[PDB]
């Protein structure tokens, strides 16, 4: 009956909790107590990109570490050349309510989506000389939160109907759907070798999914409300999350536990975005208090602040070679720090 | 720019033309009036959009129309079953809110209390501290027919007025206005929807004008 199944789930939860606790002899801090501190991180602003006329909601770096794309609520996608602050393309959208954007790893296509429950794929290289819509992918029943290219023919999306999906851009049909969350999925992150990915949702839990067969492998809890951002460590064996309780967290795949908590007593606002450095030593996080903090990821110390925006910082990214950091904000500006 | 090459100058000229087109498009799109349409399930939103769709030009639904050389756009988000707290901050900065309530629900499952809860949630929000609300009370005739048999006291235990339209409608209107807690900043406009054509859109037009004028006067006096 139902009651025996609830008791069975309680016994399985107790078994998981005891098996996790039985292999936690030492802390990450005790191990990294003898490391020298990083010191002080002082980053200046090198470029300022202007031309948006409303709030900026997403951005993504190109894989050549020079070009990038930005999305805003005035109904434009803009492609920027960060070295000279020139505009390469400007794409008008059919819907002004856009919440995410992505850049293909090859450079040929660009993806977009928002409150219209549709993911749009745009072709950047054509004989006619203008950017045109290549495909529209429909089938989600809630707003689209994030999207990431795996290839020129495969894309992974997450939505506020508590599901994720994997698409086939040639055909336009879902090949696999990932279910199990009980809240709106808000963020998503691909592994470096592109065989697994993580998803963070509004039930205050994160899940590890396997791309080849749509099954969940591990579930990580510990937050208190509404994980908003997630990212992989460069090694591919750990990840970090950021939520509304003004706290970042570091989770480890192989030990299936929690390693460190990045919280301060003077910070009481939520976190919008999170990212790592190139070597995985610094953790950068954006907040609602118009700032951006830089944390020593191994000693859990505050190392720096980026304080050049006038409204909420909504998006944040680091280049592939690790030469610069880009931040976007609701005051309609993008800045490059180095 | 004296060290640039021949191709760099043409790239800069292309970027300047892109800037010009962006500025002209923003100047053109800054002359719109944006309204957010809300309600509690089946209230009569379809009737309002049908009887205001004077001209013609799931996800989200759009409607563009003109009335006395003034353009309006009305967004409807009744198909979003996800969490409202995660996408409502996209709609701050709209000109006004159109809230639709049906008067025939005072004895149905009441269902009026759900409308009261939604109005209290949206009127005292942290993003709509200054956005004006236009309130439509649809289904007047069916309320007239139903009140003659089912007394209003089934909805309000504290009611003590007469069982007739003129008193009960004013009592409902006051039990909906008396939920604002910022009577110094915003305002509530009430209109009992009538089947006669043009009247409803006229009321919207008058309200949006007298809201724009008070905004221009409130702000430009800052110094």
């Amino acid at each position: 009956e139902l009651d025996q199944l609830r008791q069975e789930a309680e016994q399985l939860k107790n078994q998981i909790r005891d098996a996790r606790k039985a292999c936690a002899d030492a802390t990450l801090s005790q191990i990294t107590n003898n490391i020298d501190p990083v010191g002080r991180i002082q980053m200046r602003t090198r470029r300022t990109l202007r031309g948006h006329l409303a709030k900026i909601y997403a951005m993504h770096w190109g894989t050549d570490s020079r070009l990038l794309v930005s999305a805003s609520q005035d109904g434009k996608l803009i492609i920027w050349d960060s070295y000279t602050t020139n505009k390469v393309h400007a794409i008008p959208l059919r819907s002004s309510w856009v919440m995410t954007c992505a850049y293909a790893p090859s450079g040929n296509y660009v993806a977009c989506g928002g409150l219209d429950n549709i993911c749009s794929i745009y072709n950047l290289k054509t004989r006619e000389g203008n950017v045109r819509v290549s495909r529209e992918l429909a089938g989600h029943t809630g707003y689209l939160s994030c999207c990431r290219f795996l290839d020129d023919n495969q894309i992974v999306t997450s939505s506020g109907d508590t599901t994720c999906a994997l698409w086939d851009i040639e055909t336009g049909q879902q090949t696999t759907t990932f279910t199990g969350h009980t809240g709106d999925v808000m963020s998503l992150s691909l592994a470096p070798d592109t065989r697994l990915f993580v998803s963070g949702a509004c039930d205050a839990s994160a899940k590890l999914w396997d791309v080849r067969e749509g099954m969940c492998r591990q579930t990580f809890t510990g937050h208190e409300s509404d994980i908003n951002a997630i990212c992989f460590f460069p090694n591919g064996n750990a990840f970090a999350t950021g939520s509304d309780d003004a706290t970042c967290r570091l989770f480890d795949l192989r030990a299936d536990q929690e390693l460190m908590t990045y919280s301060h007593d003077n910070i009481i606002c939520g976190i919008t975005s999170v990212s790592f450095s190139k070597s995985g030593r610094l953790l950068l996080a954006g907040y609602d208090d118009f700032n951006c903090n830089v944390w020593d990821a191994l000693k859990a110390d505050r190392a720096g602040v980026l304080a050049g925006h006038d409204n909420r910082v909504s998006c944040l990214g680091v280049t592939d070679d690790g030469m610069a950091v880009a931040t976007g904000s609701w005051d309609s500006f993008l800045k490059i720090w180095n | 720019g004296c060290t640039l090459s021949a191709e760099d100058k043409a790239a800069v000229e292309r970027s300047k033309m892109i800037d010009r087109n962006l500025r002209e498009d923003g100047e053109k799109a800054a002359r719109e009036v944006k309204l957010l349409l809300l309600g509690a399930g089946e209230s009569g939103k379809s009737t309002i959009v049908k009887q205001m769709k004077i001209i013609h030009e799931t996800g989200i639904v759009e409607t563009h129309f003109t009335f006395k050389d003034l353009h309006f756009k009305m967004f409807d988000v009744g198909g979003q079953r996800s969490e409202r707290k995660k996408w409502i901050h996209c709609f701050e900065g709209v000109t006004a809110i159109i809230f639709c309530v049906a008067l025939s629900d005072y004895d149905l499952v009441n269902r009026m209390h759900e409308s009261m809860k939604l109005f209290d949630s949206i009127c005292n929000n942290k993003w709509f501290t200054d956005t004006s609300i236009i309130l439509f009370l649809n289904k007047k005739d069916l309320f007239e027919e139903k009140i003659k048999k089912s007394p209003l006291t089934i909805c309000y235990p504290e009611y003590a007025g007469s069982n007739t339209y003129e008193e009960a409608a004013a009592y409902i209107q006051c039990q909906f206005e008396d939920l604002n807690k910022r009577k110094d900043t915003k305002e509530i406009y009430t209109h009992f929807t009538c089947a006669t054509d043009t009247k409803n859109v006229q009321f919207v037009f008058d309200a949006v004008t007298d809201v724009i004028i008070k905004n221009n006067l409130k702000d430009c006096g800052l110094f």
Partner: single-chain antibody
Amino acid sequence: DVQLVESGGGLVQPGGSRKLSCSASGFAFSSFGMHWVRQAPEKGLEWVAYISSGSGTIYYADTVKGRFTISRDDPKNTLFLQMTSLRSEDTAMYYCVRSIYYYGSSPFDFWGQGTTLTVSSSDIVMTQATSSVPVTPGESVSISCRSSKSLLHSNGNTYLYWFLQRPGQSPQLLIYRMSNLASGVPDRFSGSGSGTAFTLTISRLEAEDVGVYYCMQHLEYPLTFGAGTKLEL
């Protein structure tokens, strides 16, 4: 498909005037810059005139200043050249070329068809060895083109372009900026070289690769071509 068709050529009494037109169809005309390039009856190519996108920049060759005028009409998708005081040295064949400039683009990618005009009775120098070398199908060949002034800019780019003209046709882009392979070109063509010394390498030479090869520089106006080297069986 992409098309550029020219008209307005014929026999002209010297000292007269004429107008040439170039009608495009198949692409976004208003986003491209346009060039007029002419070819003498038995010699190589020479750049003539250039009009920008948005008509904000116009350049002319050193020999047609004060005589020729270039213009465009965007709604009808037309490019015009007005020619006055026609000297007998203007007898040539005129081509209409499109080019677009942004980070990563490929200028000079589509060439027109050509119209024939028969008038009755500080520059960078690019050098090539014009002797028609013999080839056989299967082997590999190299082509050289040395400049007088270094084509390497300070931003890392080297502005050299390679074109191929098969017998009785219009030129075709092969290599742009000394290394990049054009779209639709088989991977048998390679381009390399340092400043003031460049090489084009063809491996596994087929039977459709006979013709004339030209090298061009795009470092600064006026644009200058080479004399052109011929491959024949």
